[PDB]
Every structure is written in structure tokens, then in C-alpha cells.
Design a binder for this molecule. Sequence first.
Ligand SMILES: [Zn+2]
Lengths: 7, 119
Amino acid sequence: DWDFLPP
Amino acid sequence: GSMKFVYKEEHPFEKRRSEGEKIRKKYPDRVPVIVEKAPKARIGDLDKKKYLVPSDLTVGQFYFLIRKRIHLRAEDALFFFVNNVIPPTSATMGQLYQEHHEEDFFLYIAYSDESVYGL
Ligand SMILES: [Zn+2]
């Protein structure tokens, strides 16, 4: 659900 | 005029504060950020609104990882807003979170192509 930025 | 988010209207406060407490308790080195396009903003869209961003990144570096996600066209500008204020690009995301997090434990940032919120 959560997008990591940066991965 | 004042920071109005759709994510706050789609999910109640018990629910958000509980997700925020957990996501802080799980990924401590990251801060949870909700990112939405400000009203009247003439600019591209974000697929996702939810981002775990490292505490050490500055705002400048963030303007940039987002600028890539939306990809601005010619002479589009990209500004951020937290509590109706453009965050200094020198500040970090950890300081911004500490100083501006809502009490659901999320940080809320609106983005616009204009330097004034909702214009
Ligand atoms: Zn607090």
C-alpha cells in the first residue's frame, strides 16, 4: 500500500 | 484556502492514527507522507498518495523524487505546501515531520504548479 521513496 | 485533503475525508481519525502509529512503529527510519494535488492546480497526477520517505532526505531532494513521478512538462513549476507554507528546501523530511505532522502521525503535503496554495 505504501510506496517507498526511494525504494 | 486551507489545506483540505481527500485522504482525510476518505478515512476516519481512529483509522488513520492507528495506521500511522503502526507504520511509525514498523519503519522508524522513514516518515509516512500523504501527497495530494492542491485545489486548482494545473499539473500532472500522482498514482499513489502514500510514501515512506527517509528522514535524512531534504525537501529539495523530495521535490525531485516527486518531480520524476509526475514528470513536469515545459514551464510547469512544482511547489509543496504544509500547513499553507512552502517548506524551505534546506529542511529535512525528519524535521518537517517533527514540526508539521498531523496527530494521525502522518505528514501532509499538497503540491501545485503555483507558489500560492489553491490559486
Ligand atoms: Zn504530534
